[PDB]
């Protein structure tokens with residue numbers, strides 16, 4: 459019935475105070491009222507960085523902040539009990555939970571082992587540079603967990619490679635040798651073969667790894683009650699195994715288990731290839747759309763708004779698109795920083811929230827604002843104007859057939875006819891440059907429209923044929939709504 463709306467409920471620089479799960483539980487009610495129906499939460503298990511780990515330095519995925527490992531019992535975000543209680547409170551408020559799943563690598567090993575390896579080139583991992591015996595951090599036993607839930611132990615042959623030799627003290631990519639040992643395929647062919655990223659790289663061709671990740675996945679579903687998954691770093695993970703894994707869990711549990719992968723590349727054709735090679739078993743974040751928004755926001759009005767959707771999953775395959783404006787990899791001070799200019803974000807959010815295409819995601823730092831410091835640089839991410847109102851507008855009014863007018867280089871818009879449970883009409887209009895107006899068809903005859911954002915104060919009426927001329931301020935967005 460209701461439009462689905464997800465939120466990335468974290469960012470990179472959340473404080474290390476063990477409070478995020480408590481904050482989920484305390485805000486679930488308010489978030490549901492706004493219109494959020496699902497939260498993507500950060501990796502909930504213990505990382506190599508201890509409580510400082512954002513979660514991607516994954517060490518023990520069976521330790522949800524329950525065991526004394528890597529310097530604390532809790533994770534960055536709280537304890538295991540707080541996690542389960544937050545998920546339960548989300549469910550009572552009609553909010554689903556997508557858990558972040560980090561399968562590419564493991565870090566923070568309990569011990570090192572001598573491994574016979576081939577050094578490979580950083581920029582082409584198929585170029586071999588010489589054999590070397592190394593000491594690799596690849597023994598994972600989780601002694602603080604004492605075999606609760608699982609006695610599985612990771613050793614060298616579960617991994618394809620590392621980037622650190624502890625004996626010779628050399629940083630280089632060392633590919634493990636052995637019968638059947640190779641970089642996995644298919645993965646991104648960037649850098650020749652992009653299987654290797656960081657820490658100890660999982661060998662997705664090893665039978666014991668393939669089974670262990672399935673075992674953990676069923677345990678995690680039954681332990682936590684999560685409703686689906688956000689898959690980390692999928693361009694570095696054997697595509698066929700990712701499909702194998704989610705296919706298995708959907709079959710074993712009978713649950714829908716909505717899944718979205720992070721394939722972070724701005725050429726949509728690499729994302730299309732991933733979706734083809736995984737048989738459409740998961741959505742992907744619309745990374746190319748973020749870069750369209752970034753470019754438009756830095757263009758001073760000169761961006762061709764007719765093309766704001768071009769080369770995106772939102773356009774090419776919208777039922778596999780999780781749309782977004784910003785995330786923890788693009789926010790300020792991160793390696794892949796490309797932060798959308800603040801002035802444009804109300805437009806970008808109105809675009810992903812009020813268009814019929816795709817499954818929109820709101821960024822925590824955009825919804826709440828965020829202040830932080832790193833490397834001596836102080837960052838102030840200001841809450842996006844109208845962000846709560848736009849989420850409400852999606853919840854209550856953006857329904858029914860859509861008529862699109864991406865037909866001018868500044869002024870674009872679209873209309874939504876409404877449906878039976880939501881019998882209101884809407885016309886969205888925005889401009890990245892000077893203001894203007896556009897004739898658009900809503901299909902609602904002789905009806906009164908007002909700007910639910912309160913920027914334009916006049917009334918707009920359709921004629922007897924459902925057509926009206928809607929106005930918009932420069933560098934702005936208006937959301938015209940004719941309630942029933």
Ligand SMILES: [Ca+2]
Nearest residue numbers: 640641642661
């Ligand atoms: Ca392999």
Ligand SMILES: [Ca+2]
Nearest residue numbers: 653654694695
């Ligand atoms: Ca990999």
Ligand SMILES: [Ca+2]
Nearest residue numbers: 759761867868
């Ligand atoms: Ca323009």
Ligand code: NA
Nearest residue numbers: 618642660661
């Ligand atoms: Na691998």
